[PDB]
Short mmCIF file of C-alpha atoms and ligand atoms in Angstrom, two decimals:
data_model
loop_
_atom_site.label_atom_id
_atom_site.label_comp_id
_atom_site.label_asym_id
_atom_site.label_seq_id
_atom_site.Cartn_x
_atom_site.Cartn_y
_atom_site.Cartn_z
CA UNK A 1 0.00 0.00 0.00
CA UNK A 2 1.77 3.10 1.30
CA UNK A 3 4.31 3.60 4.08
CA UNK A 4 3.73 7.36 4.21
CA UNK A 5 2.70 8.71 7.62
CA UNK A 6 0.20 11.57 7.75
CA UNK A 7 1.20 14.65 9.71
CA UNK A 8 -1.13 17.07 11.51
CA UNK A 9 -0.98 20.70 12.67
CA UNK A 10 -0.88 21.86 16.28
CA UNK A 11 -0.05 25.10 18.08
CA UNK A 12 -0.81 25.19 21.81
CA UNK A 13 1.04 28.28 23.05
CA UNK A 14 4.06 27.42 25.18
CA UNK A 15 5.21 24.66 22.83
CA UNK A 16 8.60 24.62 21.11
CA UNK A 17 9.78 22.78 17.99
CA UNK A 18 11.31 19.37 18.77
CA UNK A 19 14.01 19.93 16.15
CA UNK A 20 15.46 23.45 16.01
CA UNK A 21 13.75 24.52 19.27
CA UNK A 22 13.15 28.26 19.00
CA UNK A 23 10.73 31.04 19.98
CA UNK A 24 7.55 29.85 18.24
CA UNK A 25 4.69 27.40 18.28
CA UNK A 26 4.84 25.02 15.47
CA UNK A 27 4.23 21.29 15.76
CA UNK A 28 3.44 18.30 13.59
CA UNK A 29 2.14 14.92 14.73
CA UNK A 30 3.35 11.83 12.88
CA UNK A 31 1.42 8.63 13.28
CA UNK A 32 2.75 5.11 13.08
CA UNK A 33 5.64 6.36 15.25
CA UNK A 34 4.22 9.31 17.21
CA UNK A 35 6.59 12.29 16.95
CA UNK A 36 6.53 16.09 17.12
CA UNK A 37 8.30 18.56 14.83
CA UNK A 38 7.99 22.06 13.35
CA UNK A 39 5.41 22.76 10.64
CA UNK A 40 7.96 20.96 8.47
CA UNK A 41 11.63 21.37 9.41
CA UNK A 42 12.16 18.21 7.36
CA UNK A 43 15.67 19.44 6.58
CA UNK A 44 16.46 19.24 10.29
CA UNK A 45 14.13 16.56 11.68
CA UNK A 46 15.11 12.92 10.98
CA UNK A 47 13.15 10.26 9.09
CA UNK A 48 9.96 8.88 10.63
CA UNK A 49 11.08 5.44 11.83
ZN1 ZN B 1 12.18 23.40 13.83
ZN1 ZN B 2 5.63 8.43 11.63
#
């Protein structure tokens, strides 16, 4: 079928990117593995195991 995980958007308030970690509120939820990362930051964040 497809091994592509679907990401979602989230922005609480006091949350920080789990990749570059900076002043902002950007987060993405990856299923199959369950991870959090900037709106994208794919260049920094690793590959969804
Ligand atoms: Zn980031
Ligand atoms: Zn995943």
